[model samples]
Target: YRYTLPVKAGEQRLLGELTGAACATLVAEIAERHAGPVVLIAPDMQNALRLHDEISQFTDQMVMNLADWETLPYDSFSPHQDIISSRLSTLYQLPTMQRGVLIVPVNTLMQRVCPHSFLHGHALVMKKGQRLSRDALRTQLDSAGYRHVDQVMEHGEYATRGALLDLFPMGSELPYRLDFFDDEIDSLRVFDVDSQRTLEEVEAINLLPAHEFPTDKAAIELFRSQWRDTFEVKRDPEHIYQQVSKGTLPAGIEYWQPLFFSEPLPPLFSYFPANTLLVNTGDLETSAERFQADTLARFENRGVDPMRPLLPPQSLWLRVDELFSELKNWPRVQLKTEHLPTKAANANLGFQKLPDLAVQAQQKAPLDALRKFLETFDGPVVFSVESEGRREALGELLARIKIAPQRIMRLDEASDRGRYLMIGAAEHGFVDTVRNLALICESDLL
Candidate 1:
């Protein structure tokens, strides 16, 4: 609790170094102890995905990721439907999460998102035991922007096949196949999108809107009126105006997102609790500026397409300085790789690197280096590997000279001097000096 103790009283700001897997470990520690959520901003998606998985395995705490569009700005296509669902699902679950880590990229955090009314107003939440009329349900999905198709496919689609209603919720990764017992609702089984295998049975399901904005005739009329107010209207059948008017939600219609929503889109911070601990990592200023720069470039290039109009950069993205201004409302912690406060930072890991495992292999002392550490260190040691296959093989590999650490499901499962092994793709290994505990990752050992 060395770093943990000071962090509690450290007030709203902390600028310190957390290298390797140490940040991942300390995040779990703070997540469990904070009694509120920890929102960590990664430098980019690559690091965000890494931290998300690393934290997931390191602790039992709930880990959620808020991802990006994966499509370029002003592109002629929308983001993948699966990616859409992941974003919506996390937004639905964020407030009620109580405590956990929510990893977000700098760009994703800066972008404007759906208002509270748009989320709860359009998304339908149903339970297995709840009464829902089948025909009435069909109309609800239609108006809610979900399309009826031959089969239950991709997001925003549903198939009513006799007794079972297969629905792909826009906020879900798996399509739910629900069996309706006449008027009474029955079981709901989550099925694979391609394989069609029923994997899980759930008590309830949440079907978010097919798109972030409403696509119904009611909203479409409003958008048409909104479009007329913005631009000088004329015949451009090839453009979004004519296509959307003719009962087709064409590609890249999201740039006109502001036109569809009667209620204004809110900042992402508006979705979370005010008490949330916002953790910003890497160079926030640089990441935000680069994204804005690319956005401005796209706006200039796409302006020539009179057939396909574009939203100004300000309409979609929040400026870097202003985004940082909003962040001040929260209890923020800034993590740094440079200019570390060694007193507050825990560089607690203690173990020298092995020169060459090859030499040890040739000498029939395969892991004599690790064996010596285990033999010497009085404190408990926890070893981590990426996969189950590697973890089990490592168990056998250590047995060559009769060296073994007991297999453990989690870090807390073992506290004795006897070593423990776990299966998590931990980035770097570290020793916790305050507690005499160590997590030796695969990279740390090899």
Candidate 2:
């Protein structure tokens, strides 16, 4: 809560009410942030799996989506492969244990569940075999109006039955049950909330605050800004890429990044040594590793992942084969030029000419064809067209359709790829048609 207003004599009551609400909200949010990636200790198999499924939704929606939204369930193995390989490689190259850093990124779970560890002194404490009774623990916590409190991963609240304590750790993928015998802590294991079978074991566990670590804001913002606006001469492509890893990018520029990561302890990389990990977010297209051959050669030269299956890897590979086969029939010399904008009339004319093209096709409906094409794609379409005649043609097309995109980003003449137009609209079909035209001609077609 922000208290920016002047306080009067009777304002004390206002202060208390507002402060209390703010504190509760802050505490709840903080609790969720800390308790993830916990080591669940449960007994009942079915209850554990049920809890596991429920918790998975939270992490999937919140943590994974935020950091690596591009990788889908089918590609889950990629991130795992990345983390394991990187760890092995790094460790293999390390001369000592101290050089091996286990940096964990901060997340909602780490903030929520770990607080309990800190509150109970288990965050870093290991007292031989000391155990606290579930009944006694509940009585103490409940009597204090924490009656609605649940274990960090368990849903709703924590409940005790006999010697078992069922809890959902904050930010975890499953709830846990801890069994105790007398004053001795008995067993520690993770289980499915439904099946109740052990999922994993733990040697040591600690929950830490997420915000205690920060992202590479400067770099991230720089990358995002360059993508959104004109690219500054000083900010090279690689420099811009470095910024994306720090989560500093602005909204709506997600297309510039890749979809895979190599970190295993999901949230940890983003937490501790944030942005220390590099981005492959569709970056293999421009990755330095492409110049090298073999995995060892790749590692020795450009540290980037050499094996990141390039975007549309199968399609790209096939295209390469075709180009090789048709080498004798293709032109060996190519001419490319960087275009810059000088006038709006030029843009307006190009916009108008699009409808002209629509009118010319014998099946002969550019607008219909445009609409048909747009329906096949997603997200904003970028155009590299740069002629006054074509701009007028595009404008004519838009006039005929009587539709305008909600957001249109006309790059400065100095844009990174020289200059281009970014357009978004509710009329998806029309946009796709325009996108196709632009893609085929590398310009808005006249």
Candidate 3:
């Protein structure tokens, strides 16, 4: 149970407790200081996805939702193809993002990813006016992991119909209809994947592999040889060994991801641009350690099966110590859900828990605590409920009791010393005394 905050030596100090979704606003404020990407290291999978939505509402920056939220039941092949395609596309977009927020769970943060070699080498960038061969384009899509399907219905597939070529490439929300006048590129149209009808048109489109690794059957040669070279296994009868070697997916193929690539995979950190703000939680170290140990526990049990060998835990994941040591090149911030408010705190998180609304303790009137709070707070006060319906109902509730607060659409409008009602998913209410501002969530109503 030994735990120590690794590499806490940097000027990075702890942040005060962020009550509800207020941390999303604080992160936006922090993002303003730096033009680089803000990488939020979520403590769990759900938190990352939730923050992705909540944080986007607070800032104009693009929030990259990575693949930590979904799972394939740990299968590397077949099913969850949507997630696989999206993962590769997000990886391609990560380097190009001038500034945005990348939310990743601790597990995804430590996992290794495919090298840039596999990515750029297999990419197909096309636009209108380029003279291209029909058969050659098909081969390019095939090699780039686009499956040949009879219909254009999903991401990772290409369909041929006379002069039209439809490809639902990775990273693209809608499948494309590439109109080709024989050899010359004619036009691009966005079509409904389900209806197969043209929806819109565009001038250009780019394609990355459907999966991180090559998705074609021939790539099994590389995967097969790679597995054999790493492990001295010949004349194998195991399910994964035979199925994978025969160019078919086995149940536990997710563990065999490194086999599909030509080169050793790199950590997820390698994909990010320089000067990213890595906002990780304080418990990340302990969490990393335990996850590793838990994997090792599984390894001990599964280690006996030599035919269906598993990738060593260390090979698939980065060690916690090395993970933090690599962060020395970048600035960091520690997120603490609970912290003693020291007067000499270095980093001014500013936001603290909303003043306790003693409802039953005072026994005056219903929601009178809010009245007292609204009466005294000199600056703009905003109340955020979960949804538009809730906010509307809350407004009417406040109105019925002679509390006519203004409804604000943007945070900038919260300038006057008046009460406001807004709609959002933020649950925890917090106060910013120094900034003369406060946000009370619907849950905070007493």
Candidate 4:
């Protein structure tokens, strides 16, 4: 009920405290009501993971975590394959989903990335029944950033033997085996990496670029041209241009996305639709400031450590002021735990406060306290627990306390007239005392 109230009121920004589970519930509710995409910004990676887990409970739609490619202590860059693959997969799926939820941090958002055009233009689509020349397809994959090899054992590697072409696209779960009969594609299957056995047949597949940046020869030549002009005066002992010219990508190449494209890469906002909702789960101001400070600090030390090429702070990342300016363009909602000044100048935007619905832990036994609250509140109650085993354990405890909660098949089935216990690991109960529907987790409260 509280979730719907905000949507109906047309509140652009929300100022309130809700647990990780509650926030997910709110996001689910908002998505259901609006039937559109939502961008959820978390404070950091750990918080993003927690929110992802909770959000998974409500909807079967895609929930993505766009994490940052971290910078090492020596001002060098080390890429995490799994993290990069996941982020790329998320970006590939966002434009296709009917409803999508993406969770990201300030650092990830500020970092410049390959433009949507590069991703869209480089993707390779193959249908099982379609006719495609084997040689032509291999050349296309090569230009799309796939590396040719003897065997396909990892992401972005492909091998061709006679009429069979094996490929492992960056976003795929497994390598694909394509059997060609002349110019016609006869079959497509996913083969196991360990045994090299065909698993199953698929109708079609879309292969995303293996690497984030442009890897085609033409793009590389363009990159070299830009590189020469940018650092022709400097002592580029790292031979950055030489490496790229030889069809090799250096560490932290994702930050050098500007050179990969003929035009400047668009901000994250361009990928989102016009009707998309924006949500800030923590202190946006603080997060933006910290990102700016860290970026400045890194730029200050770039001269001392010249091994890794460093793009200018403005070219690589947006400043705090620029970040907030883009955020203001969207209909925004801010979630926080503490109170803010009642009438500050920043508070000029009319903000409406929601009714508090948090329940405190009691002095008596945990289950006993829960029973008392359930009995006093006449409407529906959801008892959230940590795990399946914990749910069963809580059931026996509740049965001993003489409270019989109806098993609800769906969240929509939870009512304001009966007791319905569902699995929501909220730290505190979100209870509408007036509506008489509450969500509680005995373990969390205890």
lDDT of each: 0.77, 0.29, 0.73, 0.69
Residue 338 CA displacement from its true place in model 4, Å = 4.4
- Give the TM-score ranking, best first: 3, 1, 4, 2
Per-model TM-score, in order, reads: 0.86, 0.23, 0.88, 0.84
Q: Which residue pairs in candidate 4 collide?
A: none
TM-score, predicted candidate 3 vs. hidden true structure? 0.88
lDDT string, candidate 1, 1-446, tens digits: 43442233234555454556767776776788786888988888898999898888868888889968888888889888888888888887776667889998987888888776787889898888788867778889998989899888788899988877888998776788887786757888889878877888999988898887888889989988988877655587787888888878888777778888766667888888655787767888899899888889999988887777777877788888878777767766666655344553333333223232222545576666776777777788777889988886677877775758788876677676877888886877766555567777777665
Q: Number of clashes in every candidate structure? A: 1, 85, 1, 0
Write down the worst ten-residue block by lDDT for model 3: 1-10
Best by lDDT: 1
Candidate 3 lDDT tens digits, 1-446 = 01122223344656765557667876665666566787888877878877877777677778777784244223333547778777877888787677878888887777778876778878888888888766778988876767788898888889988778888988777788887787877888888887789987798888888777775776888887887777766476665667776655665576677888777778888887766777765478787787677667767777666567677777667878877766666667666667546643334455678887645635557667777887787888888887877676778877866767788766767876888887766766778766678888777774
- Residue 380's C-alpha lDDT in candidate 2? 45
lDDT score of model 3? Answer: 0.73
Task: Give the poorly placed runs of model 1, Cα more than 4 Å off.
Answer: 3-11, 15-17, 126-132, 162-164, 177-204, 232-234, 339-378, 412-417
Off by over 4 Å in 3: 1-11, 72-79, 216-218, 232-238, 302-307, 340-345, 348-350, 355-364
Give lDDT tens digits, candidate 2, residues 222-278.
434543453332344334344344443222222222221111122211222211211
Best by TM-score: 3
RMSD of 1: 3.6
